[PDB]
């Protein structure tokens, strides 16, 4: 049995059925990429898989227990990035990363920021940085987390090609071990087609 | 010539002395604490620049280690 | 991580070394502002001090109450607070208890000076502190749900503002009557007791309601 | 000439370090002789008595609070006219000195009003004006310590100081309407004897010198804080070692 | 395009109504608040309510003032409104005029109602309404540079009130003295001329420097 | 003479330096892309060329006249689309376009919105729309304006696959008849190197 599965999900926003009855089971160590065609509907589905949005019909299931019951263990194994970074603008990058778990000592600190591409910009305020860097500080969480499941909503937006390559290289190691990630980008991604499994929305 | 002949009545001015000396002490305290604060902050920022020099001294040491 | 949420809210509130003074000075702005219009005669001010300090405290709390639930929506940090591995009522309890650091205890520090500026007496200052220590957290806990509902999907016309301000009626009417009855020397324990009972009730019932309110707000 | 080369921050540091110690020695000796000749070797006024000597510790600092605000305007206007970015740091240098002088003026004015008013604070004239000046100093301090960046903070502080010096005569004339209407007050400010007034002028001179010393050395502290990584501070700390 | 900016600001202010209801009910709660707490002796109310109404309007408009430039930065509207083929002070004047007609104008409409709760006469209502008309544009003009200085900062709290209210004190003094004298059936035309000169001075000076402050803050 | 001229723009700021000594000139009808090393600095450069932020040293020229004097003519011939969407979230999309000049009649209405791929969603509120099509609103602004100079900062951000080809042709048809476009992107363009100029942020 897979870790995360989706059963007869239905979404409706203002007389438009965005998606209806989509169901998919995700096995451990997989690189599912939702394709989509419209701007919104991929974002709502990625949001609803994480449990922000209660499904109108159907349910999303995690080791056989639904998301309204097993929350305290579901939130302990998830990493989410959205269109907005989710960070605090006034604080420094170091404190914004230190809010979340671990960081702290150098075994989990100052290389997570460095491998993202942010050497020499650790102490500068986030407001005084690029929007690409304002999302890079959010993408730097991947190197220190202990979450098995990652759902990222447009990760490669205004990050340079070196950052994209280093990101996907980090994603490969999480793919080899037991870990499920769902990402959605408009840009094509430069890895072999056989490893990525396409779960496209249908109507 | 002095208006106050006795040294003791320089500390007791007709029963109004305590409020005058309260004005004196609340005159002395903020100016002294301002001067000590500013001198201490000057010394602290000089020490911070010295410790900053220590940290890129270690950075150039690490660069020499990388070059060698 | 309860205390870590506490410390992060304190750190986003206060930024530099000497920055705590502004919530202290704004209250003096209001306390001087009322006699600028009303008058300098020192008996009417002793008469009207409860309305003075309670309007000032309500203004400070309502002015600072926005950052609880409004700012964190746009930056998106509220969502990953919602998915932090800790129950949401504990999270909103931490956030409102951090909000109390902004308005309540600076008010408790500045109470003797504004008591001296408004005349009164030492018993007035004593009952002043004993009712402020009970009135500020219930004010924050009661102001939280209306702010929680107003963050929801942006279509609501006029009806949501009734949930936030006109709930302060029993709290403020009970507090000002007690502080006015404390001016002429009378037993006032029976009103401090009901203020404490209201404090306990709203402290028990507020975070669990605001958790569902925040669940409803973002869908 | 030398005014054009006055704006280079290491040269400004060097001339400031030249000026500080002699200025401080002159300030402390003039303030010492002023305080001695004020508190001693002088009689008291007939009506209020020995409390009248507080007119020393109240008068110059208070007016120099006003004075330093004018000086801040003299900075701030320049900081908007030619965009001399060095002029904006003088506003932050002079702001908390003015705040401390306004606080000490308010404390002395409140403490000296006891023998007639009874209450520690009575809402009379000149004290509302000092409180408004203290509030403006609080606003300037908050606006300086509010920005994350320094140059924007200095220019916004210059704008705030310009707005304050524009609006200040209106406040200083409108508060006086509380002194014609709404009862009256006594001549507490400068009810002085004409024969013995030189210690007060020497006290005016003494604060002036002390205010100059504190604002110069704080301007030095800010010019160290602003130019953090530029190599002239590096040469300074190398000359230290 | 001046009237076009005016129309857009009116439409975007009227499209939502959650944040315009807070200051009006703040005014209402202060006016309902003070007479019940103070007491029903009629010798006090006729002299104390001149301060009460004006400071209630003052604090209501300081609660309202945050909407004027805060939301346009995260929407990118300021970066295009500085780019229009019209000088920036004219656009600032249009936006502040719309801000006056969205929250300062309904105070005059509510004035016959607020006159009922606290007594007064028809002459008092006429003087108080006309002084509100001459006073609220002045308050908006004086409060514009504080908001303009506090655009780029996240802070939406006590700092804006600290920057605005000391600049706003003379208006309160003159208006309270004027309508207090108008309660004594004395002609108050000179104080009205003083208030008009104050409005002329604010209209001359404030939008000319608010544009410069807005240019400083965004950069 | 060139339409847009630069002279020794020094923008050393905030205890660091960004660039030095650029003096690039653009005559009528060119295409230019700012090179990409970090997330921003290019954004600061574009804000310097449009006149929002004042230069520390050096100056820019429009038709041989400094920009602090020719503000009206410059503002009558420019539009700005940055990282910020530049639209009001509260209002609907049609009147968001209608605030800018003309629109109105159907000779400039419904095809400025249709040709950017946002057909069928005109009267919907912006808050119930994806951020990509929120940016496509500001991209749809391009079809109904007659400004000779375009300065675009990140147009290809959260934009669908068809949107790139839809946008590039329109910028070309702006480019022949003396339309100067100054572009910043991270996505590669399907455009030959010869017709596009490259001005680089030198170190």
Author numbering:
A (entry chain a), F (entry chain A): 1 to 203
B (entry chain D): 2 to 69
C (entry chain b), E (entry chain B): 2 to 220
D (entry chain C): 3 to 243
Quote the original article:
Here we report cryo-electron microscopic structures of the heme translocation complex CcmABCD from E. coli, alone and bound to the heme chaperone CcmE. CcmABCD forms a heterooctameric complex centered around the ABC transporter CcmAB that does not by itself transport heme. Our data suggest that the complex flops a heme group from the inner to the outer leaflet at its CcmBC interfaces, driven by ATP hydrolysis at CcmA. A conserved heme-handling motif (WxWD) at the periplasmic side of CcmC rotates the heme by 90° for covalent attachment to the heme chaperone CcmE that we find interacting exclusively with the CcmB subunit.
As anticipated, the single point mutation in the nucleotide-binding site of CcmA locked the transporter in a closed conformation, shortening the distance between the centers of mass for the two CcmA subunits from 36 Å to 29.4 Å. From the inward-open state of the nucleotide-free Ccm(AB)2 heterotetramer, the E154QA variant switched to a fully closed configuration with no internal cavity of sufficient size to accommodate a cargo molecule of the size of a heme cofactor. No heme was bound in this sample, and we obtained one data set that contained CcmA without and one with bound ATP, with only minor changes to the overall conformation of the complex. The overall conformational changes in the different states of CcmA were subtle, and the nucleotide-free wild-type structure showed the same conformation of the P-loop as the nucleotide-free E154QA variant, although the latter switched the transporter into its closed state. Unexpectedly, the overall stoichiometry of the CcmABCD changed for the E154QA variant, in that the closure of the core ABC transporter Ccm(AB)2 consistently led to the loss of one copy of CcmCD, resulting in a Ccm(E154QAB)2CD complex. This fundamental change in quaternary structure led to a structural asymmetry of the two CcmB protomers. The inner protomer of CcmB largely retained its open-state conformation, as was the case for the adjacent, remaining copies of CcmC and CcmD. The outer protomer, however, now unrestrained by interactions with CcmCD, underwent a conformational change that most strongly affected the cytoplasmic termini of its transmembrane helices hI and hV. In the outer protomer of the E154QA variant complex, the cytoplasmic ends of both helices moved outward from the core of the CcmB dimer, by 7.0 Å in the case of hI and 8.1 Å for hV. This latter shift would have caused a significant clash with transmembrane helix hIV of CcmC and is therefore the likely reason for the dissociation of the second copy of CcmCD from a heterooctameric Ccm(ABCD)2 complex.
